[PDB]
Design a protein around this ligand. Structure first.
Ligand code: HEM
Ligand SMILES: O=c1cc(-c2ccccc2)oc2c1ccc1ccccc12
Length: 459
C-alpha cells in the first residue's frame, strides 16, 4: 500500500489527473507522462511552487532552494545553484579527473571494507558503507575534506536520511495532520527527529562555512564549492550574473550536500541490491566491462560510450526501482488546468514518476528488470528510450545535479562491478522490505563480497 502504488491504481479508474485528501489537504495527483509534462513543462511555472508545509520551512534554516517557494529571491538562488553545478564540473581542464579521483578514492575504501567484512563466506549490510562513500565524494567536492569511515560524529550526521524522507515525502502526515503532534505517535516522533537532524546538518555546514569564510582572504584561491560560493557572493556584494548572497550560501550548500548524499546513497544501494538479485545482469555488465576496459586497468569515464550495457543497467535500475517515486510535493501558482481538469491556485500537487516508469504501454516488462529494454538492435543505447525514464523530474523544479548523479553512479558501479563479485544471503527467506518516503530506501539486507583479483585500486 505504497503511496505511488495507490495513486497509479486510482488512475486506472479516475484517469491520470484526480485528487485525494490527506487529512485536511486535498492533493491533486499527476500520473502519466502527458499530464506530468503538461503541468510541469508546458505550464511549468504554474506548478513550480512548493506547498506551505511547516516542515519544509525547517530545512536549511528556512532558506532551502529545494523546499522554498517560487519567487524572485528564489529564482536567483536556483539559477545560482544550477550555475555552480554546471560550471563547477568541466570548469577547468583536468577537472573531470579530480572528480573521478574522489569516486575512485571512495570506491577503493568501499570495496576494501566490503571485502574485508565478507571474509570466509561472511555477509554484511552494505548501506551504512555506501552512505559514507558517497558523502565523502561530496564532502571533498563541497568542503575539500573527507571523513574516516570510522568517524562516529559523521556517520551519525548521516544516519537519519530515512526520517528526512518520511517527513517531507508525498503521503506523509506530519504536515497535513498537525494534531498528530499533540501526543505520542510515529508522526510526532519522526518530525521531532526531523527537526533534530536538520538542526545538526545546518550547524555542521555553518561551522564549515564560517571557516572557509575566515580563510578565504583577498588573493586566496578557492579549493571548494564552499570557497566558490563564498567568493562569488563577496564579488557580488563587492560592486560588480545570478550569484548568491552570503546569507543564502550556507542554506544552499546544505540542500546540495544533503540531497546528493541521500539520493546517490539510496541509488547505489539499489545497484548492489539489483546486482545480487539478478546475478545474470551482474555477469553481463561485468562481462562487457572486461571486454571493453580489459582486466588490464580499471574503468574510467572515457569508457562510458563503449559500455552500452552498463548504461542500460543504469537506466533500467532507474526505471524499475523508481527510488524517488514521487517528487518533492509541488504547488500551483495560479488557477490552471491539466488534461481538461481545473486546478485552482495554491493547490498541492504530487507528480507520480513511478507511474511513468511502470506504465504498461511504455514499458512492456513493467514488473520485470530488463536492462536489454534500453539496448538498440545492434547493442548500443538509444537515448529515445533512455531519456524516456523519469526520476529527476522535469520543469522549473527538476533536479540540478543530474549529470553529476549519472557520471558518478556510472563510475561507482563500473569500478565495483569490474573489481568485485556480489552474492545475496541465501538463508534469507522473506524478501527485501523498503522504507517509503521521497526516496525508496532498502531496509536491512546482507551481501557477501569477494575480489575478482589483486588490488590495483591501491593507487
Ligand atoms: C540519482 C540521484 C538523484 C535523483 C534521482 C534526484 C532527483 C531529484 C528529484 C526527483 C527532485 C525533485 C524535483 C521536483 O520536485 O519536481 C530533485 C531535487 C533537487 N535535487 Fe536531486 N536527485 C538526485 C541527485 C542530486 C544531486 C547529486 C544533487 C546535488 C547537487 C541534488 C540536488 C537537487 C536539488 C538542489 C533539488 C531541488 C531543486 C528545486 O527545488 O528546484 N540532487 N532531485
Ligand atoms: O535539502 C535537502 C534536499 C534533499 C533532497 C533529497 C532527495 C531529493 C531531493 C532533495 O534532502 C536533504 C536535504 C537537506 C538535508 C537532508 C538531510 C538528510 C537527508 C536528506 C536531506
Amino acid at each position: 500500500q505504497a503511496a505511488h502504488l495507490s495513486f497509479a491504481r486510482l488512475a486506472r479508474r479516475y484517469g491520470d489527473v484526480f485528487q485525494i485528501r490527506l487529512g485536511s489537504c486535498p492533493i491533486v495527483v499527476l500520473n502519466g507522462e502527458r499530464a506530468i509534462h503538461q503541468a510541469l513543462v508546458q505550464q511549468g511555472s504554474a506548478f513550480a511552487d512548493r506547498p506551505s508545509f511547516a516542515s519544509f520551512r525547517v530545512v536549511s534554516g528556512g532558506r532551502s532552494m529545494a523546499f522554498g517557494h517560487y519567487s524572485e529571491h528564489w529564482k536567483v538562488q536556483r539559477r545560482a545553484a544550477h550555475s555552480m553545478m554546471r560550471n563547477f564540473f568541466t570548469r577547468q581542464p583536468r577537472s573531470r579527473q579530480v572528480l573521478e579521483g574522489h569516486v575512485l578514492s571512495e570506491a577503493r575504501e568501499l570495496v576494501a571494507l566490503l571485502v574485508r567484512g565478507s571474509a570466509d563466506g561472511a555477509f554484511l549490510d552494505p548501506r551504512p558503507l555506501t552512505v559514507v562513500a558517497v558523502a565523502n565524494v561530496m564532502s571533498a567536492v563541497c568542503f575539500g575534506c573527507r571523513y574516516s569511515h570510522d568517524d562516529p560524529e559523521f556517520r551519525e550526521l548521516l544516519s537519519h536520511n530515512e526520517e528526512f524522507g518520511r517527513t517531507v515525502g508525498a503521503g506523509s502526515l506530519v504536515d497535513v495532520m498537525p494534531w498528530l503532534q499533540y501526543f505520542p505517535n510515529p508522526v510526532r516522533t519522526v518530525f521531532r527527529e526531523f527537526e533534530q537532524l536538520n538542526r545538526n546538518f545546518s550547524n555542521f555546514i555553518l561551522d564549515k562555512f564560517l571557516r572557509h569564510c575566515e580563510s578565504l582572504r583577498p588573493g586566496a584561491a578557492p579549493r571548494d564549492m564552499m570557497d566558490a560560493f563564498i567568493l562569488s557572493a563577496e564579488k557580488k556584494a563587492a560592486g560588480d550574473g545570478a550569484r548568491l548572497d552570503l546569507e543564502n550560501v550556507p542554506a544552499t550548500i546544505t540542500d546540495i550536500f544533503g540531497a546528493s548524499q541521500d539520493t546517490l546513497s539510496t541509488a547505489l544501494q539499489w545497484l548492489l541490491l539489483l546486482f545480487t538479485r539478478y546475478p545474470d545482469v551482474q555477469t553481463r555488465v561485468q562481462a562487457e566491462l572486461d571486454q571493453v576496459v580489459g582486466r588490464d586497468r580499471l574503468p574510467c569515464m572515457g569508457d562510458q560510450p563503449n559500455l552500452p550495457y552498463v548504461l542500460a543497467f543504469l537506466y533500467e535500475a532507474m526505471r524499475f526501482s523508481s527510488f524517488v517515486p514521487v517528487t518533492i510535493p509541488h504547488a500551483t501558482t495560479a488557477n490552471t488546468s491539466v488534461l481538461g481538469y481545473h486546478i485552482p491556485k495554491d493547490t498541492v500537487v504530487f507528480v507520480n514518476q513511478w507511474s511513468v516508469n511502470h506504465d504498461p504501454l511504455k514499458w512492456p516488462n513493467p514488473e520485470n528488470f530488463d536492462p536489454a529494454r534500453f539496448l538498440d538492435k545492434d547493442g548500443l543505447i538509444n537515448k529515445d528510450l533512455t531519456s524516456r525514464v523519469m526520476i529527476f523530474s522535469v520543469g522549473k523544479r527538476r533536479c540540478i545535479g543530474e549529470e553529476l548523479s549519472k557520471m558518478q553512479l556510472f563510475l561507482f558501479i563500473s569500478i565495483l562491478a569490474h573489481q568485485c563479485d556480489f552474492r545475496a544471503n541465501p538463508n534469507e527467506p522473506a524478501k527485501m522490505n523498503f522504507s517509503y518516503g521521497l526516496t525508496i530506501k532498502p531496509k536491512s539486507f546482507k551481501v557477501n563480497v569477494t575480489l575478482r583479483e589483486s588490488m590495483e585500486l591501491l593507487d
